[PDB]
Amino acid sequence: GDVAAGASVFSANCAACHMGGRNVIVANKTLSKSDLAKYLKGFDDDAVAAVAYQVTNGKNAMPGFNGRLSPKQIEDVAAYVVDQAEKGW
Amino acid sequence: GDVAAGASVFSANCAACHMGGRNVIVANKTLSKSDLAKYLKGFDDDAVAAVAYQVTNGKNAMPGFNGRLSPKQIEDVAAYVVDQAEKGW
Amino acid sequence: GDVAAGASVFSANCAACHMGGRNVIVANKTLSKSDLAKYLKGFDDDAVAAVAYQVTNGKNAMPGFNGRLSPKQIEDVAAYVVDQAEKGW
Amino acid sequence: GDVAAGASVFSANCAACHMGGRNVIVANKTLSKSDLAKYLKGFDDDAVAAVAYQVTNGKNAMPGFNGRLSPKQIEDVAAYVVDQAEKGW
Amino acid sequence: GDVAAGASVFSANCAACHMGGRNVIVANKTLSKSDLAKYLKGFDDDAVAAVAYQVTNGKNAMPGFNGRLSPKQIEDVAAYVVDQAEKGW
Amino acid sequence: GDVAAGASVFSANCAACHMGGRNVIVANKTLSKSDLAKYLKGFDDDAVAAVAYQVTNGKNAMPGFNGRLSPKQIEDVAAYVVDQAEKGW
Amino acid sequence: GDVAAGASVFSANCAACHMGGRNVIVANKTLSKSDLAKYLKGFDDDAVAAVAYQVTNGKNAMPGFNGRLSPKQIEDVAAYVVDQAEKGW
Amino acid sequence: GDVAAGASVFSANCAACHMGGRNVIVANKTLSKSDLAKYLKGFDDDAVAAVAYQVTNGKNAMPGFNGRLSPKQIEDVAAYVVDQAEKGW
Amino acid sequence: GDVAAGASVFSANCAACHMGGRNVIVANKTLSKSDLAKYLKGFDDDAVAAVAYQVTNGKNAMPGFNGRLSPKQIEDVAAYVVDQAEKGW
Amino acid sequence: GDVAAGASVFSANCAACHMGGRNVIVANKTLSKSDLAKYLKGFDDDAVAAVAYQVTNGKNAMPGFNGRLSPKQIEDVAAYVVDQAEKGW
Amino acid sequence: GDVAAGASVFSANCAACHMGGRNVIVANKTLSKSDLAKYLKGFDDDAVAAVAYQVTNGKNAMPGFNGRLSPKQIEDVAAYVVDQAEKGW
Amino acid sequence: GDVAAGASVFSANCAACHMGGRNVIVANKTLSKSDLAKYLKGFDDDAVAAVAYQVTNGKNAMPGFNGRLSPKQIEDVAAYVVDQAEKGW
Amino acid sequence: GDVAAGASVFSANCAACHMGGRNVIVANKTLSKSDLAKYLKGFDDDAVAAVAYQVTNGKNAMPGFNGRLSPKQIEDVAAYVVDQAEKGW
Amino acid sequence: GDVAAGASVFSANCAACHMGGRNVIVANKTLSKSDLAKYLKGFDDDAVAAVAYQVTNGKNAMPGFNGRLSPKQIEDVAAYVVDQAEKGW
Amino acid sequence: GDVAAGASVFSANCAACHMGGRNVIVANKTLSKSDLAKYLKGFDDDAVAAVAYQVTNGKNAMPGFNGRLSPKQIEDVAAYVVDQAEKGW
């Protein structure tokens, strides 16, 4: 449910710009472990947390989802992202 | 207006899951003084504040209303909740 | 997520006949602990399981959701029902 | 009620492919005693049971109704089929 | 027809979560021989059967298709999956 | 599958004008052996083939399905028609 | 683009209450340098930042745009406000 | 096209009350040769014409289609009715 | 039903220009016995018929209802008009 | 209240066909003392009762209000009708 | 009009449970002469009246239409039912 | 079924004004044995009948359900009321 | 009628904020004798009048109904409130 | 303007119940000098004032217009009523 | 909230004729301090009160809002008007 629900959240909220784990706005900032490690702050420490944080506050071109998603929904989707990034989309 | 307006805010934004001060998602986390005291962080110190904080940031299954409601609207509704919880819905 | 997601499942699939935990078809077979204990087979052994089983296979007027819901969705909703029945809808 | 309710179940779930007791998909596998005896496994032993079993698990082009119908609904409709087949549709 | 029809069934019912033989929900449980062998029960004994069984009953986040698909449709799609997995999607 | 799948094809593509094996456009050109024998070219020689040919090229008011259906789908449905016509719809 | 895009953001999100740089809700809290200096916290230190902060978190009657706008969009619009306030709307 | 187009006209304009050639309003006034002969004026002289005339002017509960249908459309549908009535719907 | 149904027909189709039995288009051509007698052809022979005829064919500014209303509907409404005109609207 | 409330009842339920105390369906059966005396059964004996009875059971084209209105509402409106009829609408 | 209007009444009020003259609630209590004779009280004496009476008072699962329909409307629809049942829907 | 079905009838038709056996319109005329005995005519002879009679004809502010409910539905609900009143709601 | 009509007025105009005699806006100012006595001016002298006065002029967050309701409607509803408050909602 | 504007006010606000100077609710309380003298308090002393007062405060079934109309509007319409009553509507 | 809520009230109820603080009906009677001082009675003593009073009772062409707005809503909007008039709309 954690990861499995994150999938739902993802298609409904993230797939627009992160189809297939890519990045339709800023090309080189994708959701691949490689990039996630390179550009996400604190990704090596706590992957999920790092992602979750980003999702919550947004960044540059990327809006945050603080009001839109429940904390749970955010954990779930971050968890999904990490899990998907580990296998390679 | 403080409490009286909070009522408007409440029906329009909270009644969906907190009809009658209950909790349609997580049964045991209702808006009764009893529960509010038990589960809300800092409720005995500053009731309103505590509530307001929750509303602002959300929690688990409950989304936050940071972007959706104005700070005022949040104070107002929290104030309502407390007032209503004190008399017992 | 377990219980919290069950809530979603419930409104989308059960509220039609069990809005408020009642029973719009067969009056006396509601989702109150009292009734659940009285009429559900094995409720006193494993509440969730008992419920889940019912949901999966249906019973009399009540259709089963075997094909419609994923096992996970069924666990989740059953979990919700129990949790909600414990506090009293 | 047994047979009488099976009738309801039948129109709502079986008449699509078995209107008039025929077989719109596989011509020669109808619901006539003659055919039922010829192709249904164990029809001579326990007619109802045999039918019920088929309904529950499906077979080849025919889907099963395990999750969709309650066990009772299945008994009921099988009972109907047998009764109707005895009389000749 | 066996495999060829399974293809139809697949796009219509499975491609949503298994496009390209991947797994959009649970990353590491894909439809590659490698994974199918690793996680599917009895895959080495009877590939098709194993798959068919899964499809029929569902598993965890994956719903079953017992009522939705005819036994035949299930054989067909399982047959497709195996054939496609052998070649590598 | 041959005949059984033709059934699917039939409802999805032919039942509009041939529900019950009749002919809603040109009354007397139905799908009964009697008529099929009377009006279809080469029906006596190779029933299926004859039908299949018609389906592929269409005729007068009846459109052909050359591009719409795969050769297989056409064989299948023709096979169905013949089988159904032999038993009498 | 910084300032130029902020203009777009502004009409689409702020002009409703800050038409012409005024304040339709709270009269005396406008977007004129004079007022901005008087009431905005830290305006003399970093104008843009100060504004941006306000926009992000909202204040009293004014909602925040944390979830609605991307950080960039917020920088852009704040930049616009300052630039416009410097010349005098 | 005469008869074949009449079919289109028929479903679009007559099937509402004459589906299957019956009469949903006045039971015994159907479109069967038997009835058509019995109740339609001049049916044994010029079938089509008789029908066409009815369609044009309407009769009792049945509205006429003078303004709605083109003369051709009327000929066409009348022709269809006769042809269909001759074979027996 | 004759007169009583005519009432329905009347509001739905005639009241637009003949509310209260007046004539919103051509002032002096109302539905009062006085006028009806004066301007309607054959009103003193067969009131209903006269009216009915008008309704069917229309006249000058007034459209006819030949295709729109069934002959019965026309009889009914004409009957209503006469009955209402006799008492005086 | 008796008569005064009947007024409310009247506009809400009777004015549709009896606005101004007339009769839009059956012209000559109005609510004038003259007519009421002529056509209502027992009007001379107990005016109110007579009316009330009609209202309760309906008559020909006029539906009854047995289930729709409470006995009280019926008394009230009948009382109104009589009072209004006495003064002449 | 009698029968013809009953048709309107029927679709608007009865077709929901008696479309095609069947019985969607209680299978075996249809509107066929056969059944009507078997289960309706006094059907052999005065068909219409018998039906009308049922319609007026309802019976078991079937609600009555006393307040909803005018006596007239009830006569009309009963008349329709009988007429339709005589021919055979 | 008698009492058990009356429960269904009750929520669907009576709970609006008699939730919990109270009386939302006329305070002191509730459904408690105490009151029922005090105000219902003949309650002390045949409880059910007394109630049933009331339900059928209504009384003052309370509408009757003669046309709306079938006699069985009325018996059933009256039976429920009595049973519930004996037990104290 | 006095009290009984007040009930109608109440649901239509007061139940929005006083459902069940509570106070959805200002928690502690309910319609219980206890509170009514505590906060309503002159409640001990003339209950109805006191209430009626409030309803007419409104008070704080509660609007008055001077123009909306007739004096009568106001008496009626006040009378209801008192009667209901005496019994305890 | 005094009287002339009162006319506007009257059609817009009073004609609903006092068309033609009658009284659609309470028959015998019309706006004729005769009645006005008979039932209006102080009509003989200051006609206008008397009327105006009534309009302002309402009476029994008649609502007051205190908040709805400006004092002038009230003077104006009262003036109209008197003037019209003197002349006999 | 006082002023801030008045803003809401204003757009919803006053902007129609006082958009931008102007006066669409009577040109020279605007909501500018200048005019407010000139034409509003007692504006120099208690601005808010003066305004509030006007709003409550209306004046000439301007309707009053006595019944429509709660006293609180009236205070709020008056407060807004004054505040807005002080800075200059």
Ligand code: HEC
């Ligand atoms: C489109 C408008 C976006 C939506 C919807 C979401 N994201 Fe996004 N995301 C977007 C951009 C342009 C960027 C790069 C911003 C920058 O300057 O760094 C991002 C970045 C991410 C990242 C990090 C990727 C990396 O740095 O390599 C994550 C983890 C991320 N986005 C997650 C994410 C999720 C899960 C979303 C749904 C809730 C989501 N994004 C939506 C643009 C957009």
Ligand code: HEC
């Ligand atoms: C439904 C989707 C929700 C909406 C809308 C709001 N709340 Fe909620 N709230 C919800 C849940 C599931 C929970 C429990 C979450 C947890 O794990 O703790 C809450 C909790 C609260 C609480 C605290 C109750 C307690 O802990 O006993 C408060 C004070 C609260 N919610 C307030 C509140 C208000 C005022 C809302 C409207 C703006 C609101 N909630 C909406 C779910 C949802």
Ligand code: HEC
């Ligand atoms: C309406 C058509 C139904 C839907 C949708 C669901 N349920 Fe139901 N449920 C229904 C009936 C008529 C009955 C009684 C059947 C009988 O003869 O026993 C039930 C019963 C239950 C129960 C047990 C209640 C009890 O016995 O006291 C449970 C636990 C239950 N239903 C759960 C449930 C859930 C969670 C559903 C959604 C997935 C659901 N039901 C749907 C009718 C209907």
Ligand code: HEC
């Ligand atoms: C259409 C898609 C079907 C529905 C709906 C149901 N049945 Fe069916 N049924 C169908 C087929 C194609 C077949 C033959 C499959 C084969 O290869 O054997 C069947 C067979 C039966 C039979 C046995 C008939 C015989 O073998 O002579 C029974 C008893 C039967 N079906 C019952 C039945 C009932 C009661 C259904 C409703 C719940 C039902 N079928 C639905 C196709 C379809």
Ligand code: HEC
């Ligand atoms: C999305 C909601 C799903 C649909 C539609 C289908 N499948 Fe799926 N499938 C899904 C998940 C999340 C999983 C993993 C569940 C687990 O915990 O094991 C699966 C798994 C499979 C597998 C096995 C893959 C493996 O274990 O390596 C098979 C063979 C499979 N799914 C087949 C399949 C087919 C053919 C479907 C269409 C009828 C189908 N799935 C739909 C999620 C979903």
Ligand code: HEC
């Ligand atoms: C409606 C627009 C049609 C659709 C869809 C299909 N058919 Fe049809 N078919 C139609 C007509 C008007 C006719 C007669 C044309 C003529 O002038 O001969 C036909 C005829 C057939 C026949 C032969 C029947 C006979 O001659 O007795 C066959 C075998 C036939 N049609 C098959 C068929 C199938 C299987 C279709 C689905 C793929 C199909 N038709 C569709 C009109 C229409």
Ligand code: HEC
């Ligand atoms: C209307 C509902 C608002 C929208 C949309 C936005 N703002 Fe606003 N803003 C509003 C109010 C009522 C106030 C005053 C709140 C208080 O009590 O201080 C503000 C204030 C500002 C300010 C500061 C002005 C000052 O203090 O002098 C800024 C810089 C500001 N608002 C910016 C701003 C921008 C850029 C917006 C769009 C994204 C925006 N506001 C929207 C009310 C509302």
Ligand code: HEC
């Ligand atoms: C429903 C409102 C109707 C529509 C649409 C059409 N018809 Fe009809 N038709 C209807 C009725 C009630 C009757 C009987 C009227 C009477 O009192 O005689 C009819 C009759 C016919 C007939 C003659 C049947 C017979 O007398 O046995 C024909 C030939 C007929 N209708 C043709 C027809 C056609 C082709 C239509 C479409 C253009 C059509 N009807 C529409 C009611 C209705």
Ligand code: HEC
């Ligand atoms: C408005 C566009 C009309 C509708 C709708 C209907 N009628 Fe009419 N009607 C209209 C006009 C302008 C006239 C006068 C035309 C002329 O030059 O004579 C009429 C006339 C009648 C009459 C006769 C009145 C008289 O001559 O004194 C009748 C009997 C009549 N109209 C009936 C009638 C009915 C029943 C209608 C509904 C089906 C209907 N009219 C509609 C304009 C319009």
Ligand code: HEC
């Ligand atoms: C329209 C569909 C009607 C509604 C609404 C009501 N009434 Fe009616 N009423 C109507 C008709 C067609 C008739 C005549 C029926 C007949 O054949 O006798 C009536 C008659 C009355 C009468 C008697 C008038 C008389 O016979 O002179 C009364 C007293 C009456 N109607 C009262 C009445 C009231 C008070 C209604 C509201 C609750 C009401 N009617 C509604 C048609 C319709």
Ligand code: HEC
């Ligand atoms: C669905 C909720 C119904 C509506 C709408 C109407 N009827 Fe019905 N009807 C219904 C049922 C469940 C039954 C059987 C009740 C029993 O226990 O006997 C009936 C029965 C009839 C019958 C008699 C059929 C028979 O006994 O064989 C008639 C004549 C009948 N219904 C008529 C009828 C009409 C004309 C309606 C419209 C006004 C109508 N019914 C509506 C359920 C429902």
Ligand code: HEC
């Ligand atoms: C609300 C509009 C009502 C509905 C729905 C039903 N009842 Fe009622 N009931 C209502 C009132 C106002 C009264 C009192 C009327 C009077 O002046 O006596 C009643 C009374 C009863 C009673 C008797 C209670 C007593 O006298 O102590 C019974 C037994 C009763 N009502 C039963 C009942 C049932 C079973 C209903 C559903 C079918 C029902 N009522 C509906 C108002 C209303």
Ligand code: HEC
């Ligand atoms: C309908 C709901 C009403 C509206 C609108 C207005 N009036 Fe009325 N008015 C009405 C009633 C029921 C009564 C009688 C009340 C009673 O018990 O006395 C009245 C009375 C008057 C009168 C006095 C008539 C008389 O006593 O003979 C006057 C002068 C009067 N009404 C004036 C009046 C005006 C001018 C209105 C518009 C602003 C107005 N009424 C509206 C019912 C209704």
Ligand code: HEC
């Ligand atoms: C339009 C139909 C109006 C609405 C809506 C409101 N007002 Fe108005 N207002 C209107 C007019 C024509 C006038 C002048 C009347 C006169 O003869 O004096 C007014 C006046 C005011 C004023 C005083 C302005 C001045 O005298 O300079 C105020 C303070 C005022 N209006 C306030 C106001 C408010 C706050 C409203 C909303 C609740 C409101 N008006 C609505 C016309 C209309």
